[PDB]
Amino acid sequence: ASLLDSNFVPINFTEFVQAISNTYKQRRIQFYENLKR
Amino acid sequence: ASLLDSNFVPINFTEFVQAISNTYKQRRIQFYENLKR
Amino acid sequence: MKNPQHDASLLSNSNEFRDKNVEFFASGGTRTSKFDKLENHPFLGYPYKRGVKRVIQSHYEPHVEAGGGEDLYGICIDIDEFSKTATIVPITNNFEGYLVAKDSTVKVKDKLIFNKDGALEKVTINATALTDAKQISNEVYLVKVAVFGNK
Amino acid sequence: YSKSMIENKVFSSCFKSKNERVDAYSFACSSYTDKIEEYLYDPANSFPYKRGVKLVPKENSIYVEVGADTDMYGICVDVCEFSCTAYVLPITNNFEGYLVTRNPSIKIGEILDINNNGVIIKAGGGPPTAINIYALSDSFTINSINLIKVAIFGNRGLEKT
Amino acid sequence: LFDENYYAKAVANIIGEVKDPIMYKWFSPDQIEDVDLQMGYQKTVKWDAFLNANPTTIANEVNTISTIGFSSEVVRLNYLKLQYKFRHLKQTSEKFYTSDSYIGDINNNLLPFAQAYKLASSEIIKLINHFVLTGTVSIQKDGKNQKRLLPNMYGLLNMPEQIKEEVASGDKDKMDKIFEKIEAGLSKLELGDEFSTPMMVIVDPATSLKLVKPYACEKWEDVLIQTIKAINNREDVYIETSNLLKHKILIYPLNSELIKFKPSKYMLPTPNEQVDKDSTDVAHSYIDFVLGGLLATRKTILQVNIKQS
Amino acid sequence: LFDENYYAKAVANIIGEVKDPIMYKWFSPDQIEDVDLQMGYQKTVKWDAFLNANPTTIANEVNTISTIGFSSEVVRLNYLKLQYKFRHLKQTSEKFYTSDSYIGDINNNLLPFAQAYKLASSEIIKLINHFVLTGTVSIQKDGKNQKRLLPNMYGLLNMPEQIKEEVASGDKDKMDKIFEKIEAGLSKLELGDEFSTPMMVIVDPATSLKLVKPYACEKWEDVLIQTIKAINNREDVYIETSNLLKHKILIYPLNSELIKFKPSKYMLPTPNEQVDKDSTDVAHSYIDFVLGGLLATRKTILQVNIKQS
Amino acid sequence: INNNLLPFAQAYKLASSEIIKLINHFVLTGTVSIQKDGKNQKRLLPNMYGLLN
Secondary structure (H helix, E strand, O other): OOOOOOOOOOOOHHHHHHHHHHHHHHHHHHHHHHOOO | OOOOOOOOOOOOHHHHHHHHHHHHHHHHHHHHHHOOO | OOOOOOOOOOOOOOOOOOOOOOOOOOOOOOOOOOOOOOEEEEEOOOOOOOEEEEEOOOOEOOEEEEOOHHHEEEEEEEEEOOOOEEEEEEOOOOEEEEEEEOOOOOOOOOEEEEOOOOOEEEOOOOEEEOOOOEEEEOOEEEEEEEEOOOO | OOOOOOOEOOEOOOOOOOOOOOOOOOEOEEEOOOOOEEEEEOOOOOOOOOEEEEEEEOOOOEEEEEOOOOOOOEEEEEEEOOOOEEEEEEOOOOEEEEEEEOOOOOOOOOEEEEOOOOOEEEHHHOOOOOEEEEEOOOOEEEOOEEEEEEEEEEEOOOOOO | OOOOOHHHHHHHHHHHHOOOOHHHHHOOHHHEOOEOOOOEEEEEEEEEEEEOOOOEEOOOOOOEEEEEEEEEEEEEEEEEEEEEEEEEEOHHHHHHOEEOOEEOOOOOOOOOHHHHHHHHHHHHHHHHHHHHHHOOOOOOOOOOOOOOOOOOOOOOOOOOOOEEEEEOHHHOOOHHHHHHHHHHHHHHOOOHHHOOOOEEEEEOHHHHHHHOOEOOOOEHHHHHHHHHHOOOOOOOEEEEEOOOOOOEEEEEEOOOOOEEEOOEOOOOOEEEEEEEOOOOOEEEEEEEEEEOOEEEEOOOOEEEEEOOO | OOOOOHHHHHHHHHHHHOOOOHHHHHOOHHHEOOEOOOOEEEEEEEEEEEEOOOOOOOOOOOOOOOOEEEEEEEEEEEEEEEEEEEEEEOHHHHHHOEOOOOEOEOOOOEOOHHHHHHHHHHHHHHHHHHHHHHOOOOOOOOOOOEOOOOOOOOOOOOOOOOEEEEEOHHHOOOHHHHHHHHHHHHHHOOOHHHOOOOEEEEEOHHHHHHHOOEOOOOEHHHHHHHHHHHHOOOOOEEEEEOOOOOOEEEEEEOOOOOEEEOOEOOOOOEEEEEEEOOOOOEEEEEEEEEEOOEEEOOOOOEEEEEOOO | OOOOOOOHHHHHHHHHHHHHHHHHHHHHHOOOOOOOOOOOOOOOOOOOOOOOO
16 A cells, blocks of 8 residues: 555545555665665 | 475475575575675 | 404304303493483593593693593493594493403402592492403403492 | 563674573583473572572472582572472482582682582582582673583582592 | 545645655665554564584484573663644635745745645654754754653664763864774774674764865875774775764764664654644644654764864 | 474575575685585595606607606595584464564573574574684683594684794784785795685784774785785785684685685584474474585695784 | 273373362362362462462
8 A cells, every 4th residue: 555556545544644654665665776875 | 406496395304404405505606696896 | 442443354253142242342331221311522542431530621621531539420331433522421320331340350249449540440339240350352351330320 | 689680772782702691591511311390499588590409398388499519409400480480400410501609710620519508619618518510611700690610410429628 | 535635635646745854874774674653662672592512513322412592682662752733724725825826825924735744744854864863852053952852762873872982172173183082982892793884974064074184195084984994894984964963973884783773654744634624714734753763782883072162 | 294394394484584604705606515424534536637758749650659647636524513402482382472573481581493593593603604714613702612623624724734924922013024924924825827816815803903004195905915916916805804813814815726615515504303392382402514624735825823922 | 900000091081080170179269289188288379369268
């Protein structure tokens, strides 16, 4: 359940919060993937 | 015969030990391949 | 040595099943229990079938050597030459088997003490002789004893 | 005191010398066919962990209390504080492991004796020793409790000096 | 849900425009691991093994074998829930304030919900970054009026049981004296078996200006990097500059086996369900975030303070 | 088998979580070749050829042709088997100790078999790494109570018939004296026709600090690498730092024709079939490993020892 | 008979019956003992009581 997925449709506020946390986690993973030092 | 294979089903303990020895060997080969000094 | 490996040219006739076990190569004990405690230790010299004492000092771990008296620690019942290790039965465990006797004076019903060389000599007491001393070769005497501790 | 002994704000910092812990496994070298017995111990008199204990038959149960070498039944190797149960290796069995000592300066190979508190001390104190105890390592202090690796193998025939 | 909650729909649409936190640059990817908690404490157990004696030679028959022991250690971590409130325009009132290519009352500083949420989230994320680096919560440049926090809630700068070095105010401008303290602090570091790991350096702008000065044709920065490389098995050494620090130098390894970050998975800003409504066009909304989750071993962070007086 | 032996099942599932030994970084991939032997000795035969005289010119008729001879050399390597025992919970008892987010008795220091095996294997591998580098087995920081080993069982540091250099305790802090000894040792090195090969350098952490010092805008490390590049046909030169060494420097080539590692294919930790069981919830297990198998030619390793007293 | 050895089935049944009697005694009385005198009681944990104690 991620907001990045267009097909995702939350049912209630609780699922909405879960989607937000998953979205933040994936962005952090993507950030480290794209990071160069 | 290695523990990496999902299709590998050991029959007795001797085969199990041989699989572990192979698994250690394959990991060593993999380690040197990914090693960049 | 426990097993002197020498090549032969003829086979030795061995058919009689009596008087075949009293030999210097027969390691272990005559009667052994599954719950007997065994410890392997590094050794010096050749303490095979003798009383062993633990000697403590590049620093190395303690080893064992032939000995007895107040320093008696156990009995060496088997030896491995390649690994230079000796299997030892601790003195807190009773043992029944053939051990090295100092001379032929030891007879049945004789109470025996481990001397400074790990050999059994007549009279604290440690073992009770079961049979008479038998000369395996030269000055090597083997006696069957029932080790029970120290008095 | 206790063995486990606590929340920490931060974690505590090679493989060498990591066994110097009060709650370490007592047997340096274990062996199947070692006999281990369970007994009760006094929860307010003396903590018997890693000490020489004696059997005290009370009016309700047989307890184990810290004792001297003269009347020693065995060595207490572990304690379950939830049930206040002490686990004892009888003196008839060999032992090679870490025990509580009161002398912070003991060398290797020295002859040792257990005192009235079930504590390893030097055998030169004067009491005639009745057990074969030898120091396999120098005494080390955990900050404070002093421990030492010892080998115990049976009783001594004639009491020494 | 999106058919009924306009605000939830607006957040989901504009969640991607929020920039990533800069604290991610201070940790390796493996050092961060989320946990499921909002407020309270959580206990972490670390297990270890040790050798009790020399290994036992297997020859002939033997029953006495050397043993391997185990140990455990427990660390407690505290988590705190914090909240903010902001005002915005009601959804049905946006049509009456849609001006030429911009929405909102310039005179009254009112914004639509979507823009208000994005700006508010950015400010909060900056605050979270300040706490992780410093361990304190403050909205002043002085760093005073700090909000009182629970124990077991520390940043990289105030983590206890670490190597703290202090430079006297008389040598505030002597790079040789400052570097001397760094070398002493570096020696006292205890990386154990994990010394082969990349290292991270965090400095304040004043310190960075001093570093680029020539070494008394080499620079103090180069000397510092070489010195760190001497202990981390010649691995990568990263240097970062932050304006949140003041005359402080932070050095710590980027290894998950020594320093681990365990934030709550709700740490970043999250909208609250409650929305305040009345007869006017102005509404109110709430944003939630959670602080805490830093874990580190003893004597693995070097904190150098250059006293100014 | 996995339907009957839970422990065999558990080992296979968690065998991949054990990190690789760090000793692999000290050898080239071609230098390691496994053998099939648990305990004993193995004789390795190396063949060679030589030219008896100048070649024969083929012209007109001739029967007397120059000959090419052969030679052999036999080397014996000893392998030792060692074992360890550890206690763990029983499979049928784990359900009663499965706490929240962890399993095991914190009070009793008991772990499930899977976790126990992983921790036990890690410690054994650390011991194996120490032996290969040093040649000695000990569990104390002082390096005493060493387990006596068989002959023909050498590590890199204690291999005989190599170049050994000693630095006097009075010169323990003079890098110029230390580098002078290194050059003398490098001169005595004899690589013959195999000089075109990468070289490996291992130093203790104390020496590593000294290496980054300015040369007496150049570093002692830079001078060392250039000096080694002179003799090895300017191949790659690697520098490694190990906490297992103390005031020692090891330099040796990574050429499989000079130094070869022939460990047993059972050298790494391997579970044993025997599991001790009783009426209680505590069980015991055994882990096996094999030591030995290092072979090197004469005068191909430089061992520098800096005396402290 | 001469050595008081039974098949496992009968041995288990008798032993279980004996233990069940002991369990019944503990629930009603709160103490565990094998003596008619009631002494030599096994020490129990706190917050472990019977109907009588």
